Amino acid sequence: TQQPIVTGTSVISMKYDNGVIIAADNLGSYGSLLRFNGVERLIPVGDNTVVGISGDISDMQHIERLLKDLVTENAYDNPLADAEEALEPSYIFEYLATVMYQRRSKMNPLWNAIIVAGVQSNGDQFLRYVNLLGVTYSSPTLATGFGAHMANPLLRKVVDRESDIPKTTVQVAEEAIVNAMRVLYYRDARSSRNFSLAIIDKNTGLTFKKNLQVENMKWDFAKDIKGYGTQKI
Amino acid sequence: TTIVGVKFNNGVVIAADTRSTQGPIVADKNCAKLHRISPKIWCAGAGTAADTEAVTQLIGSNIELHSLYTSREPRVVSALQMLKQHLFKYQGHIGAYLIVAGVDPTGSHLFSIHAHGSTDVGYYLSLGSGSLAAMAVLESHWKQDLTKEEAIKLASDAIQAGIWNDLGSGSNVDVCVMEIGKDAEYLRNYLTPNVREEKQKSYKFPRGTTAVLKESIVNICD
Amino acid sequence: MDIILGIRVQDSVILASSKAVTRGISVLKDSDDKTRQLSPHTLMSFAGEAGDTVQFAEYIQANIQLYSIREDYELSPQAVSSFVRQELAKSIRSRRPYQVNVLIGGYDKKKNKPELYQIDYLGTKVELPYGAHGYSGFYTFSLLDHHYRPDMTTEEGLDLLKLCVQELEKRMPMDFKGVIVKIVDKDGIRQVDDFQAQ
Amino acid sequence: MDIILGIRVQDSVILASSKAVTRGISVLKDSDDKTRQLSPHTLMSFAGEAGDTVQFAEYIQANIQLYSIREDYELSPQAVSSFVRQELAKSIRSRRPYQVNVLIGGYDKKKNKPELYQIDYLGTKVELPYGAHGYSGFYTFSLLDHHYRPDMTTEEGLDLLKLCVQELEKRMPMDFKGVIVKIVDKDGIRQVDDFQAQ
Amino acid sequence: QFNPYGDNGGTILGIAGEDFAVLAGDTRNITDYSINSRYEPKVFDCGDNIVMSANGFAADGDALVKRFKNSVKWYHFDHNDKKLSINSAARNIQHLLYGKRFFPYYVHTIIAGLDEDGKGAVYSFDPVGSYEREQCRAGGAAASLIMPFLDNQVNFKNQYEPGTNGKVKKPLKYLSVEEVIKLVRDSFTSATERHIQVGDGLEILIVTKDGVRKEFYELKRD
Amino acid sequence: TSIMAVTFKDGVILGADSRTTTGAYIANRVTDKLTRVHDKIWCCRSGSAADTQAIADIVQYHLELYTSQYGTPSTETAASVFKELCYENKDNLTAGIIVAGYDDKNKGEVYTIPLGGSVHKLPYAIAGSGSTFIYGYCDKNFRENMSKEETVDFIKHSLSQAIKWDGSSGGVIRMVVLTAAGVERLIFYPDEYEQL
Amino acid sequence: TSIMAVTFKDGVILGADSRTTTGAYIANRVTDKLTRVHDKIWCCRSGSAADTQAIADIVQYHLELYTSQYGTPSTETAASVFKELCYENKDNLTAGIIVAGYDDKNKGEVYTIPLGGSVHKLPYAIAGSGSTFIYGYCDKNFRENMSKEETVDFIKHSLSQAIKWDGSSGGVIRMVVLTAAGVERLIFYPDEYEQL
Amino acid sequence: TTTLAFRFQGGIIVAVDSRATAGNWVASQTVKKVIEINPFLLGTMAGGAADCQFWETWLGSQCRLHELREKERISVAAASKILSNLVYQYKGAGLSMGTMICGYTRKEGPTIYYVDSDGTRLKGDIFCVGSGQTFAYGVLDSNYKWDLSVEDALYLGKRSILAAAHRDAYSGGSVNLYHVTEDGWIYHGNHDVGELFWKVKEEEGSFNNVIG
Amino acid sequence: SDPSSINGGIVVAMTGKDCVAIACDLRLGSQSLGVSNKFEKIFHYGHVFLGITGLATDVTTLNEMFRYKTNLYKLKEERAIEPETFTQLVSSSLYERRFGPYFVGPVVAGINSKSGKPFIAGFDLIGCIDEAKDFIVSGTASDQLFGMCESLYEPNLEPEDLFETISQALLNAADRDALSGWGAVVYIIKKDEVVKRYLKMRQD
Amino acid sequence: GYDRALSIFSPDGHIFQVEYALEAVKRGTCAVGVKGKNCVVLGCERRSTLKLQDTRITPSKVSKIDSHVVLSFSGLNADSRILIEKARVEAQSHRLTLEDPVTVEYLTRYVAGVQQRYTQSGGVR
Numbered sequence A: 001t002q003q004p005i006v007t008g009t010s011v012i013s014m015k016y017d018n019g020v021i022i023a024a025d026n027l028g029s030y031g032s033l034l035r036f037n038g039v040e041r042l043i044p045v046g047d048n049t050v051v052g053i054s055g056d057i058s059d060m061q062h063i064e065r066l067l068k069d070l071v072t073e074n075a076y077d078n079p080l081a082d083a084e085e086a087l088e089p090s091y092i093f094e095y096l097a098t099v100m101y102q103r104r105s106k107m108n109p110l111w112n113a114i115i116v117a118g119v120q121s122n123g124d125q126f127l128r129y130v131n132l133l134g135v136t137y138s139s140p141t142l143a144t145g146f147g148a149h150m151a152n153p154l155l156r157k158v159v160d161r162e163s164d165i166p167k168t169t170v171q172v173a174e175e176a177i178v179n180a181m182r183v184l185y186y187r188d189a190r191s192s193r194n195f196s197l198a199i200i201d202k203n204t205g206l207t208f209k210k211n212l213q214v215e216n217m218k219w220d221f222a223k224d225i226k227g228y229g230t231q232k233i
Numbered sequence B: 001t002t003i004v005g006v007k008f009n010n011g012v013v014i015a016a017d018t019r020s021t022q023g024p025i026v027a028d029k030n031c032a033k034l035h036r037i038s039p040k041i042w043c044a045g046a047g048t049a050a051d052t053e054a055v056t057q058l059i060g061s062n063i064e065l066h067s068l069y070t071s072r073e074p075r076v077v078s079a080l081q082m083l084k085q086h087l088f089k090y091q092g093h094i095g096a097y098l099i100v101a102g103v104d105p106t107g108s109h110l111f112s113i114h115a116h117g118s119t120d121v122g123y124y125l126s127l128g129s130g131s132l133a134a135m136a137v138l139e140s141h142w143k144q145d146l147t148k149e150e151a152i153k154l155a156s157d158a159i160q161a162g163i164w165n166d167l168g169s170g171s172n173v174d175v176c177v178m179e180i181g182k183d184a185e186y187l188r189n190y191l192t193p194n195v196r197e198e199k200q201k202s203y204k205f206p207r208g209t210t211a212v213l214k215e216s217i218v219n220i221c222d
Numbered sequence C, D: 001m002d003i004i005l006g007i008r009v010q011d012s013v014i015l016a017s018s019k020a021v022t023r024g025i026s027v028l029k030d031s032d033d034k035t036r037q038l039s040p041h042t043l044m045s046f047a048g049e050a051g052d053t054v055q056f057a058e059y060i061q062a063n064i065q066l067y068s069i070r071e072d073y074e075l076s077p078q079a080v081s082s083f084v085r086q087e088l089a090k091s092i093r094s095r096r097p098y099q100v101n102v103l104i105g106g107y108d109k110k111k112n113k114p115e116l117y118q119i120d121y122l123g124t125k126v127e128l129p130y131g132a133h134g135y136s137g138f139y140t141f142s143l144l145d146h147h148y149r150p151d152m153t154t155e156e157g158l159d160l161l162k163l164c165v166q167e168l169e170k171r172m173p174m175d176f177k178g179v180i181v182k183i184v185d186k187d188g189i190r191q192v193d194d195f196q197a198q
Numbered sequence E: 001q002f003n004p005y006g007d008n009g010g011t012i013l014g015i016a017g018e019d020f021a022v023l024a025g026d027t028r029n030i031t032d033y034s035i036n037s038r039y040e041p042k043v044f045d046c047g048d049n050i051v052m053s054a055n056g057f058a059a060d061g062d063a064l065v066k067r068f069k070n071s072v073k074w075y076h077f078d079h080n081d082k083k084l085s086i087n088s089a090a091r092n093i094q095h096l097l098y099g100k101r102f103f104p105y106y107v108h109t110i111i112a113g114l115d116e117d118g119k120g121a122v123y124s125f126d127p128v129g130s131y132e133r134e135q136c137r138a139g140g141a142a143a144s145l146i147m148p149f150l151d152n153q154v155n156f157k158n159q160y161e162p163g164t165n166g167k168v169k170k171p172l173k174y175l176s177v178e179e180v181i182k183l184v185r186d187s188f189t190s191a192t193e194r195h196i197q198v199g200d201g202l203e204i205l206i207v208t209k210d211g212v213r214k215e216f217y218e219l220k221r222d
Numbered sequence F, G: 001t002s003i004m005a006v007t008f009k010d011g012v013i014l015g016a017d018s019r020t021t022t023g024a025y026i027a028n029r030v031t032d033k034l035t036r037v038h039d040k041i042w043c044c045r046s047g048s049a050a051d052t053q054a055i056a057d058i059v060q061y062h063l064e065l066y067t068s069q070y071g072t073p074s075t076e077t078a079a080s081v082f083k084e085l086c087y088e089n090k091d092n093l094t095a096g097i098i099v100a101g102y103d104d105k106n107k108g109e110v111y112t113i114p115l116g117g118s119v120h121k122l123p124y125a126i127a128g129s130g131s132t133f134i135y136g137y138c139d140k141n142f143r144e145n146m147s148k149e150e151t152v153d154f155i156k157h158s159l160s161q162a163i164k165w166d167g168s169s170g171g172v173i174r175m176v177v178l179t180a181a182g183v184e185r186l187i188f189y190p191d192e193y194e195q196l
Numbered sequence H: 001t002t003t004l005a006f007r008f009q010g011g012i013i014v015a016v017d018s019r020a021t022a023g024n025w026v027a028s029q030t031v032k033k034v035i036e037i038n039p040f041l042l043g044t045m046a047g048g049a050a051d052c053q054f055w056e057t058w059l060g061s062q063c064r065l066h067e068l069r070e071k072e073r074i075s076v077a078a079a080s081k082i083l084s085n086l087v088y089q090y091k092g093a094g095l096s097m098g099t100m101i102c103g104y105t106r107k108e109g110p111t112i113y114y115v116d117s118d119g120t121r122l123k124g125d126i127f128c129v130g131s132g133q134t135f136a137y138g139v140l141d142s143n144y145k146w147d148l149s150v151e152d153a154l155y156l157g158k159r160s161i162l163a164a165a166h167r168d169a170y171s172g173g174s175v176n177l178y179h180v181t182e183d184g185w186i187y188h189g190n191h192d193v194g195e196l197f198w199k200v201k202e203e204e205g206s207f208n209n210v211i212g
Numbered sequence I: 001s002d003p004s005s006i007n008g009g010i011v012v013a014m015t016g017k018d019c020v021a022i023a024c025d026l027r028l029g030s031q032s033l034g035v036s037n038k039f040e041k042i043f044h045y046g047h048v049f050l051g052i053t054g055l056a057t058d059v060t061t062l063n064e065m066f067r068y069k070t071n072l073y074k075l076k077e078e079r080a081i082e083p084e085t086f087t088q089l090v091s092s093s094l095y096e097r098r099f100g101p102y103f104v105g106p107v108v109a110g111i112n113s114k115s116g117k118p119f120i121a122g123f124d125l126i127g128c129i130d131e132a133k134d135f136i137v138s139g140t141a142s143d144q145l146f147g148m149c150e151s152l153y154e155p156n157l158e159p160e161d162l163f164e165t166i167s168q169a170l171l172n173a174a175d176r177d178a179l180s181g182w183g184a185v186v187y188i189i190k191k192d193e194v195v196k197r198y199l200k201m202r203q204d
Numbered sequence J: 001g002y003d004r005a006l007s008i009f010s011p012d013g014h015i016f017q018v019e020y021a022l023e024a025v026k027r028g029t030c031a032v033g034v035k036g037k038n039c040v041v042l043g044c045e046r047r048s049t050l051k052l053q054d055t056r057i058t059p060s061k062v063s064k065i066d067s068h069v070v071l072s073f074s075g076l077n078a079d080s081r082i083l084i085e086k087a088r089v090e091a092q093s094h095r096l097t098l099e100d101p102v103t104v105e106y107l108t109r110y111v112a113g114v115q116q117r118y119t120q121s122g123g124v125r
């Protein structure tokens, strides 16, 4: 048993017709101190998988090293390590899920919430969640922390059920993700303006975008707000 | 509960869902959460339900008397000042969380009030368990200089976000529109997107299914 | 805790109450009468917190006696019980509540019926053919459920209490030092002075 | 708690132990024998925590019987008491201690002297002319301080136990359901089968 | 302090026919007042004509199902591909549960299938391994809403033959698969109306001598 | 919350962020923490929003009644009324008020009233959770008798740093300028002050 | 405690105050918080003195054994060994370590290791109770590729502010300069840095 | 729960209710609280349902091992002590079992042992165990003689469980009856309190307590 | 611990076609111990009926309070209290004790004598009015009652059919609760007459 | 520890260490037992190689395992003590768990089990 010290906030994701999108900001908070601004919380694994991690950053870095070891170990005595016997998103996840549940069962959790986004070899979209309790679930949209409360509602307006997936494009999906990151910057006190976004597409592969910023913000109405009830000037 | 307020060019609209709960159980599937302070000052509540209803009626009563005494239309700032001073006195023990909105001779107004007595002012607000779902919609689609139709749509979309995504919110959408020049219009069950489907069976029993020990006529008259 | 039993038969109410007064590690008395006569045909027994028990009983007694003199009239058992319930119900939300449980056995001279009321410290009143307070009910209620009949004589009621007391003397961990038994009927209240070896 | 009394007179040790076994609101048994013969001339009585009490006594019994067979010889009461004390002293600093208090009444055939040992759950051993465990001592010790003599016969000892039991039956809150009495002397261990109405 | 348990809500329902059995459960998965997924199946075909659900804390439910499925696999390896009878599965599950008596699987587990005479069977489990074969059983969040309805409609409790003065009970004439499905669907619409953790979708697994079949039905999403 | 008040050659300027949070959720991103208690006596509020609003409203009432009887109150007098309320009710209050005002005689003045209800007259004052992160900056950069433009730059830079590091601070930077010329409201948006 | 490490053109400089307290009593006013784990790999220590002393000694042991077998370790490797100890024993440690080092290839490097045991490679780092007060100052004044004299001035001004406001910081400002030229110990007394 | 077992002229009667609860929720009305160890041995269950069920099934296995190994049926004393000693090993871990081990052997005759999770083990003629034990005792003690017929003894057990089912909120459902003789145990049926109460009320004239 | 769970009990009310029904169990216990099987929880003031679950002493006290208040109402108003108006009296009377409340779950049932309109309502312990067209439930088996009612109920039931539905809702709900049952009583209420029936049920 | 397989099979199928243990028995002093209808009698011989012994204290060849069972032997005296001690411990253990003394068959079966184990355990003869 422990307590999280350096923390990452929301990770948000959704699937679209040809793949999956996943995003997370670049902040490592220390309580209410916005301590570290160059923290990458999206971990790519090979060319078909991105793991997004929120929660304790010391644990995130430990999980990061586990994933690098998985790639190394998979390539041992494996002539098809970059072909048929390369790591699938489903393998990455099931491994992580196993670890998360064993650690919670030892009363010593990895204090995180994890979203594994990717595309399987057959072309299928992979999107699944796991957290410090070892709880797992899949949904057309997934998000951690504040993203669950604020991003899912917006993302679910685009993909409300399974049948909305083939109708949704990369452009529409990405715009919806980017809008949600702006909303989280408005209302989450542990969020940063700077974020990373990753697209995994069954045709165009892994597209990793760094150093994105929330743009097109509405603030001008604030000038007209004075007082808290009766004050006029 | 999900409640929202949205200002538009010539007034203010408020809306709320209709689910009332006792823990995870749904007590009332069509509760009316939009209360009246005065004819053109309406109110939506969250938190302790008895406290929101009681505090809204007490201030509503005192506001009517004030209106009669002064021979003037009641002002939203008066409702605000009376609500917050009452709530502050009780140090949050009256668990009333309100979005209060209305029009008066000085114009249109939108405020929120928390249980400890603090108040906020804004062009769009949300409260209740569905607050974050509704706010996501408000932060995504709100703009300055909305029309009445656009504000009703936006507010209604915001309540829906709460209905579908928050477990503490559901059933229907109630709306009240308050415009500067006109009468306030309460739109009870403005949307009804959660109609229970036709059951598979009737459970009307054959008469005499229930065993009876004793039977008698009760006297009401005197 | 103390044994407080009551039973309503055809023509009387019988109240049985334990004689022990114990504080900590010592039985201080073994002849304690846990009862007060409220009026010629109304008797109340009591059990609960050390000081509160007698202070309450005597407070009620004084009030009923005051009513009797003012009106030159005896209140019905029902009226007395309702008065007692309200007094208990007041105290439960007061600063320091009366922690006292009572049984009221009375003979209604207007109805010519015996009546037994059980009232707990919260003000929970209920009219019963038989009653008990505390852990004693866990043994006696099932016993009386079996052997009780509403048309019993006073002598049969006393046999039935004997069976209740023997069960309590077998299975209760406490030594409650036997019981004082009193009968309430149309002729008033009398004590059965030879229950020790009846 | 359970009553455990002991008294060494001229030529014997007499142990008196209550018969009640109570769990919560119910007396489960009224004929319980709270004792084990450890050897032909050594008797141990016990009281304390529910399961621990018998488990400990039987474990001791098994060990003394094992010794007797191995050595073809009965250990002295002093030796048995020291062994018992050491086992208790071990357990007090263990994971889950034996919460058991014991008296050990023995007749030393080498010395031709009766001997009584009081040992509590901590391993506090002491040799006494009379002993009690739990609250019962708070009544009996002063009673025995007055009436006890070291040259008393076995019969005078029994009369003296009766006086102790009557005092406990008068002033103790619990109904301990009488006692089983056993005498340990040069001829071994026998039970006084008619103490209920002696 | 770290709390190793959570509550993923949802509800499950098992009814056993004469030559069939069904095990149903909603597909909603929640944490607090948020939905995690509208479709996350919790009722599984474990092989050997046994269906199983372990509802409550999902991470314990998945672990248990996973272990039981593996138990079936090894039972074949160690006993010449012998079929695991429903009674044998039940006893096996008792030991899986009681193995963690001092750190329990926080679930209510129900299995269903056919016994060795071809009769429909439902077995339901206490969180630490206490079990009994039953005619029907609801489990999970809305269990307290659905069980009494099953007592009334499946086992005809409190129902008497009209005109018999409450002396002759309604006989236990047993239900078809069509009639059972109706009760299941009506139970899950009732629970969806009144329990906030229940809804989204219903998934029913039906077991016969011909194997396991699935049916899915939409539930309200608020 | 990050708030400050700075005296300068022509008077005094109050500055504040616009974020109020309940936990990690931003309940209001356009809060106005600069509160008028008299024409040219304003305050910056930190702590319980309920408490500081209740305090400011009581003070405003007292200064309105004072004015009706004795004419315009001094900034010292306003601070004393704040102090009296905060000190005498210290058990039931969680308020950190900075009081700032301009009169013709005394020019700009700043009084800070921390949690306990003590009063401290200062050239400038900083408060709120974000203030911890700018003690260094403000001490090295503050000068007396600065111009309006320099003081606006000093408050803007200081509060941008407080906002940068404090999660409890954010939104816009509001300012209120108090001089002989009157009362001027200023606002600065994220796209500006984040670039500094 | 106030500690920092700053990379600059020629290498890296570590800086620290000298105050250690038990409550409000200063148990040591001349503490040396700049600790050598290798020739040109040093650390700044904050948190439990017992913990950080034990950590640093074990790290120094590992790097001595590393050198014997594989030659001079990189600054990253040293940071990795600190991290391993801090992370794996996070339940029983209260250690906040900044690791700074120089080698010929990589020039100067700074790695900060906060309470949890995470690692963060930074251009400069600040830590210790006093650091909160200089987040603003340092962010506005740090520049990359500063000279030795500029960097000494930046650290001296920064820590003097941390010391000024933080009660748990004080005494002398120690520095350790790490470059190709070697290792240089600097010290600055109160009468110099308080005047800044 | 209410469970009882008593010895009499004709052997041993064993009677139990069948209600399970979690707080005030009625989990089941059809729980078998008697376990058939072998044709001459029974065990009763009260307290933790899983603890009783699991360890008494285990007890059965241990008793069966004894037969194979010693070529002889296990004594009631020995069977009861297996469970007693197992339970004692777990003392403090939070096991919750109130248990009666009832049976007949040639050596012992009809025998009953009370065993609980405190580690208490008691031989005796009469025992009532569980949340409704007191209610059963009241009816059993006031009507018990050694010289009851098998007919009267079975009824007394049934009527004593009914008494507890009625007054104890956590007891109810149905009554399961057993009779143990030299020949072994005989099951005397499941008796639903829903019908048993009104039948007994009418035929016996008891329960004037209730609105009939 | 919970004053709402010491004595046990349930109350349920339903509307029908020109009729209302209100029912309750008869149990009065103390934890596991059943004490009385005669403890009725439905009262009436003129034509307005009030069920009350929860702590028994408050059930009694509140009945006496509303008897007292509806009596004075009738003497001043010169007419009987109506269901709508009585609901408000209960609500305001309950909220009056906001910070020391009666531990109860009252339920109002009746027919307005003017409009002939069926009316039911429920409250929480501090007076929040649950107004529902279909049904109101209260007590220790409220979850069970919600389940039975939602399943069994349909609108516009005739008095004879409504009796069956409400009786069977109460019965099956009680039998899944240790603290409810021990007999039951149902009131079928119409404009002109009111019928009271005692139900046969399990006594365990 | 030491776990050498000392008791093993030879090509002809004998375990020489067990058979050599029998030769130790052959060397041991004679011991005889005969059953009556109402008794059993155990007879043993004593050597006369060395005489001048104290018979009060010298261990006898007949040992009580419990009040009702006795054990005599032939072979290594030191080896017999280990069996006797284990037998006596098991006797008290039986009384503790079964609440009845051992049958003679069971006590014998236990001792025989111990002996057997020492024929296929590593590091022991």
Ligand SMILES: *[C@@](C)(CC)[C@](*)(O)[C@H](CC(C)C)NC(=O)[C@H](CCC(=O)N(C)C)NC(=O)[C@@H](NC(=O)CCCCC)C(C)C
Pocket (backbone or CB within 6 Å): E104, E106, E126, E127, E128, E130, H001, H002, H019, H020, H021, H022, H027, H028, H031, H033, H045, H046, H047, H048, H049, H050, H052, H096, H130, H131, H170, H171
């Ligand atoms: C009587 C009903 C009185 C309580 C009888 O003793 C029952 C025994 C038979 C069913 C064998 N006891 C109960 O049914 C249990 C009462 C609770 C316990 O006493 N206790 C020690 C747990 N009820 C059950 O055992 C229920 N199990 C749970 O309580 C275990 C849950 C552990 C949390 C992870 C279940 C069978 C309804």
